[PDB]
Design a protein around this ligand. Structure first.
Ligand SMILES: *[C@@H]1O[C@H](CO)[C@@H](O[C@@H]2O[C@H](CO)[C@@H](O)[C@H](O)[C@H]2NC(C)=O)[C@H](O)[C@H]1NC(C)=O
Ligand SMILES: *[C@@H]1O[C@H](CO)[C@@H](O[C@@H]2O[C@H](CO)[C@@H](O)[C@H](O)[C@H]2NC(C)=O)[C@H](O)[C@H]1NC(C)=O
Ligand SMILES: *[C@@H]1O[C@H](CO)[C@@H](O)[C@H](O)[C@H]1NC(C)=O
Length: 587
């Protein structure tokens, strides 16, 4: 029997007589494919190697359990810090959060693919051992009576038994699901011999698995046993995959199950499973996009787990404002340090720069998904600019008589552009999409207007205010002013609307609350996630409306700027219209 144990900076084998890492807590293998997976609590990662590759980095905090399904070819792990258990394919793709609720400090995990069951421990105020289906079916609590700091769960498939230790009560028990025999950090099995690692001897102790007698010593001097396993093919019994030729018709994940056909079709986190029961939707249909200062994250509003997948993006340093075009599936954000605006997909792939030049404090960004333009406000230079989503055709759209412009939004199908203002006399303004008809919409009871949402469906606009700590609702002209909620407002404020709910950031920028725009009910969605800056709730599919600009750029040689009264073509900096008001020249 060879024994594989997570050291911490090292990974190594012991007998019967991978290095250069910082804090390993867990280890596993798929002997058939010759793979070895480990977890790093300091590096915040899970990697693999053959006899290195990144597998899960996209946001862990302390993952201590790690188990490989060799039959469904899936990787299961637990994060004691984030209070959730997750599954993924062997290389990390198609990642799914199996559990998240009623979880304290999930530690060790072990699998039984043929039966399709998982097992794990809780290290909270209420420590426990619980099992469920490999598909997250039927959560069942098994051990509650007398345990504190349980760890190193191991199963004997040859004799249908479950072993474990207790790093606080110094026993090694055995059971199965019920009936319990009493017979130490991590532990494993091989044939007749159960090997464990002792908190106070720093050696690998071994004993009989039926009686216990013969308390032999395997290897001394072993200081760090963060996890321990038996490295043998026979530790992973063979079975045919019940999924078969092709994922049992699953479009994505085919996970082992205890019941029915003994396989269950699953979808990655957030995304829903169709009437089919085998095919996923093409991603989540409803997204809450999130701009932290240094990361960028997404929350599906399709599922009640609200899990913020980190976007795989490089160099976010001081992000501020965010928005998204549904037509191309593009995310656009701004960065107060890099002094630029960036592009990318939900994935975080295809990352590109959109604008790099004369930007100071781009506190507001807005996509026009009809005319295919992009607007932003700049508190620094004190002007509202517009390009195309590309970043070309840059034109200064409002500059004179504008001080401290902040949040910006557009109503392309109507022809309206709304923004907030500070300075000498703060206000909410409206113009046509070419800066024309600049009119003041709200004049009084404003201090620091911070965020604007449009309720396109119901002719409403929403805003919030730093100084007055109020979030107000109003008609998009013909007023119906009303303060919907009363709460403190962050200087930089992530404000967004979609559906029947309204998303915003709390004072400390530590949490995102939503409010049912109609009623009043406030439920905190995400917690414990600092440095929130900006938000955009959006329907990735649904694209509402159109105007004449959507066809052949309204016959304009550069910018198509839509008024409710018609349409005017526009020109970049240095350009000028010719005799016909449709073509721009360099005079
Ligand atoms: C269980 O046993 C079968 C039959 O021996 C294994 O056969 C393997 O087939 C795959 C391709 O299907 C080859 O890559 C391997 O070389 C075969 N293994 C051997 C030992 O010859 C089958 O893979 C086994 N099941 C699992 C899940 O690995
Ligand atoms: C970004 O750039 C492309 C390519 O420059 C633009 O494509 C224009 O598209 C129309 C088709 O209706 C052509 O007639 C123009 O000749 C193209 N313009 C140029 C300058 O080449 C387009 O503006 C942008 N892309 C998208 C998808 O909107
Ligand atoms: C805005 O406020 C100023 C100063 O009180 C006032 O003169 C003006 O009439 C107001 N505008 C509107 C549209 O009410």
């Amino acid at each position: 029997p060879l024994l594989l144990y997570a050291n911490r900076r090292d990974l190594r084998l012991v007998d019967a007589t991978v290095g250069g890492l910082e804090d390993a807590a867990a280890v596993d293998f798929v002997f058939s494919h010759g793979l070895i997976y480990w977890s790093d609590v300091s590096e915040e990662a899970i990697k693999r190697t053959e006899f290195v590759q990144n597998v899960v980095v996209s946001g862990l905090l302390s993952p201590d359990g790690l188990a490989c399904d060799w039959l469904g070819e899936k990787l299961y792990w637990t994060d004691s810090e984030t209070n959730r258990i997750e599954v993924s394919n062997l290389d990390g793709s198609l990642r799914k959060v199996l559990f998240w609720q009623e979880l304290d400090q999930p530690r060790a995990i072990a699998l039984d693919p043929s039966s399709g069951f998982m097992y794990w421990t809780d290290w909270g105020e209420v420590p426990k051992i619980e099992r469920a289906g490999m598909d997250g079916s039927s959560r069942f609590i098994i051990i509650n009576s007398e345990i504190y700091w349980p760890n190193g769960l191991t199963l004997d498939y040859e004799e249908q038994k479950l072993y474990w230790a207790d790093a606080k009560l110094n026993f090694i028990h055995k059971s199965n699901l019920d009936g319990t025999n009493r017979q130490p950090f991590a532990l494993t099995l091989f044939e007749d011999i159960l090997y464990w690692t002792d908190w106070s001897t720093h050696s690998i102790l071994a004993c009989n698995k039926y009686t216990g007698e013969g308390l032999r010593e395997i290897h001394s001097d072993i200081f760090s046993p963060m996890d321990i396993h038996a490295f043998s093919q026979q530790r992973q019994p063979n079975a045919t995959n019940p999924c078969g030729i092709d994922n049992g018709g699953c479009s994505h994940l085919c996970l082992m199950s205890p019941v029915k056909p003994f396989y269950q079709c699953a979808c990655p986190t957030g995304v829903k499973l169709l009437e089919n029961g085998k095919t996923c939707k093409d991603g989540a249909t409803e997204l809450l996009l999130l701009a932290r200062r240094t990361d960028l994250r997404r929350i599906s509003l399709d599922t009640p787990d609200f899990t913020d997948i980190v976007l795989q993006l490089e160099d976010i340093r001081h992000a501020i404002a965010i928005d998204y075009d549904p037509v191309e599936g593009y995310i656009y954000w701004t960065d107060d340090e890099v002094r630029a605006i960036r592009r990318s997909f939900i994935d975080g792939s295809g990352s590109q720069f959109v604008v790099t030049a004369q930007i100071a404090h781009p506190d507001g960004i807005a996509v026009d998904w009809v005319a295919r333009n992009l607007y932003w406000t700049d508190t620094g230079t004190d002007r509202i600019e517009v390009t195309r989503l590309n970043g070309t055709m840059r034109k200064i759209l409002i500059s004179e008589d504008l001080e401290e412009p902040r949040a910006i939004v557009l109503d392309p199908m109507v022809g309206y552009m709304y923004w907030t203002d500070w300075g000498e006399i703060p206000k909410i303004e409206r113009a046509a999409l070419d800066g024309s008809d600049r009119v003041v919409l709200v004049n009084t009871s404003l201090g620091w207007p911070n965020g604007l949402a449009l309720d396109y469906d119901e002719g409403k606009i929403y805003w919030g205010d730093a100084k007055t700590d109020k979030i107000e609702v109003m008609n998009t002209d013909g007023t119906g002013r009303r303060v919907l909620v009363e709460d403190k407002i962050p200087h930089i404020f992530g404000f967004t609307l979609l559906g029947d709910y309204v998303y915003w950031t709390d004072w400390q920028r530590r949490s995102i609350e939503r409010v049912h725009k109609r009623s009043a009910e406030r439920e905190v969605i995400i917690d414990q996630l600092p440095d929130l800056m900006g938000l955009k709730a959006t329907n990735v599919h649904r694209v509402i409306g159109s105007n004449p600009c959507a066809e052949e750029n309204g016959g304009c040689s550069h910018l198509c700027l839509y008024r409710p009264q018609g349409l005017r073509c526009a020109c970049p900096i240095g350009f000028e219209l010719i005799s016909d008001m449709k073509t721009c020249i360099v005079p």
